[PDB]
């Protein structure tokens, strides 16, 4: 599923990501835009052999099992395919674990390089939330 910007903002806020661990909603929408272009089916191989999955490009080295990543912890206890569903619950629940583990949203490379320090609240402007 390719989400609309405001459609994704509303789903993220329903799951409680708005100001989760201090990160306002626009941070999460900005991160999803540049990680996946709002596409739940997005998959991208990483240089280290792992793969990133779903709307928030969650990585198979630590967080989900895809059966082909060597160092694979599966800390969210899910198959990586679960992160590709039209329902974003699994991705949100796993992202909450990731963002609570020390470096916050810096775990998302696209967030650090393209959202951090910018006007992230632009990503929810015009949305009825």
Residue 49 CB contacts under 8 Å (≥ 6 apart), including other chains: 69, 70
Q: Is 11 in the site for Cl ion (CB under 5 A)?
A: no
Q: Is 49 in the site for Cl ion (CB under 5 A)?
A: no
Q: Which two tokens stand for residue 107?
A: 């775990």
CB of 102 to Cl ion, least distance (A): 26
Catalytic residue list contains 52: yes
* Runs of H (alpha helix) within the chain: 5-14, 25-36, 89-99, 109-114
Catalytic residue among 7, 18, 35, 66: 35
Q: Is 126 in the site for Cl ion (CB under 5 A)?
A: no
Name which position in 9, 17, 32, 42 contacts Cl ion (CB under 5 A). 42
DSSP 39: B
Q: Which residue is nearest to Cl ion (CB)?
A: 4
Which one of the spans 34-42, 47-55, 66-74, 94-102 is the region binding Cl ion (CB under 5 A)? 34-42
Q: Which of residues 88-117 bind Cl ion (CB under 5 A)?
A: none
Q: Is 2 in the site for Cl ion (CB under 5 A)?
A: no
Q: How far apart are CA 48 and CA 98, in angstroms?
A: 19
Catalytic residues: 35, 52
Binding region for Cl ion (CB under 5 A): 4-6, 42
């Amino acid at each position: 599923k390719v989400f609309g910007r405001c459609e994704l903002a509303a789903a993220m806020k329903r799951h409680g990501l708005d100001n989760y661990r201090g990160y306002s909603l626009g941070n999460w929408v900005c991160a999803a835009k540049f990680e996946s272009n709002f596409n739940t089916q997005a998959t991208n191989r990483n240089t280290d052999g792992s793969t990133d999955y779903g709307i928030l490009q969650i990585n198979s080295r630590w967080w989900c099992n895809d059966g082909r990543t060597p160092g694979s912890r599966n800390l969210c206890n899910i198959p990586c395919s679960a992160l590709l569903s039209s329902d974003i619950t699994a991705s949100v629940n796993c992202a909450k674990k990731i963002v609570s583990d020390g470096n916050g949203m810096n775990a998302w490379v696209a967030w650090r390089n393209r959202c951090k320090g910018t006007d992230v609240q632009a990503w929810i402007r015009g949305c009825r939330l």
